[PDB]
């Protein structure tokens, strides 16, 4: 649970930390989903969105 | 044809004749030739596709003049 103004406080390397973490989460979720060990499907959507936000912020900071 | 170069005297397309007509063209070409010339400025021999008319133009007008006029048209001489 994050938002853009919340993230814009974070510097780059912190963003990459959260980025890699979220990708690990997405991976573990896909395995759980196959296995059937998952119920809250929507976390996939949420994580996918957060990754998009993070790349977006990086590109803002690279075109600013 | 490769097309003239100093003027642009391209073809034309006639048609009929006498003795009853028949409708039927016969391109009226221009008379281009392959005369060459010499540029004393840059020390070079140039070959062109120029009609006799254009040769007339040259000899009463120069060659430098003509190549400048062709440079305008940007022909790939």
């Amino acid at each position: 649970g994050t938002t853009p103004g919340e993230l814009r406080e974070l510097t780059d390397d912190e963003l990459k930390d959260k980025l890699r973490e979220s990708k690990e989460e997405l991976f573990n979720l896909r395995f759980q989903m196959a296995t059937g060990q998952l119920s809250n499907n929507r976390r996939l959507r949420t994580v996918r969105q957060e990754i998009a936000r993070v790349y977006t912020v990086l590109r803002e900071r690279e075109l600013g | 044809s490769a097309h003239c170069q100093v003027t642009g005297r391209g073809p034309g397309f006639g048609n009929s004749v006498s003795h009853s007509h028949r409708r039927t063209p016969r391109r009226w070409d221009p008379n281009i030739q392959n005369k060459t010339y010499y540029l004393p400025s840059e020390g070079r021999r140039i070959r062109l596709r120029v009609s006799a008319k254009g040769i007339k133009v040259i000899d009463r007008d120069g060659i430098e003049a003509v190549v400048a006029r062709m440079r305008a048209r940007g022909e790939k001489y």
Binding site: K16, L19, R20, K23, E24, L26, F27, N28, R30, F31, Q32, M33, A34, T35, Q37, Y55, L58, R59, E62 | -
Partner: protein, 97 residues
Amino acid sequence: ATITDPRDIILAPVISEKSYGLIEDNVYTFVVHPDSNKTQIKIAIEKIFDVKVDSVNTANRQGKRKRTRTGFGKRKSTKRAIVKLAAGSKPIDLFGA
């Protein structure tokens, strides 16, 4: 920026009797991205699990072609990759059978 993550290639496991007969003797089958390859998959896996792969394989699968009131549709192709972990032998826990 762009960040190569190895966990975006490996998409998912495989869950089936063949796969489990392989797991009984330490061979694991995953589903990968079509434009992957064996060196890339080897590196991804022996990074992610810090475990010692020695040989990798692959396969392709042309998707099935079902029918509909509309007409003749078609599922998606894939690429299945098959890994034989070496004598290191730490099974992949996150699999969850």
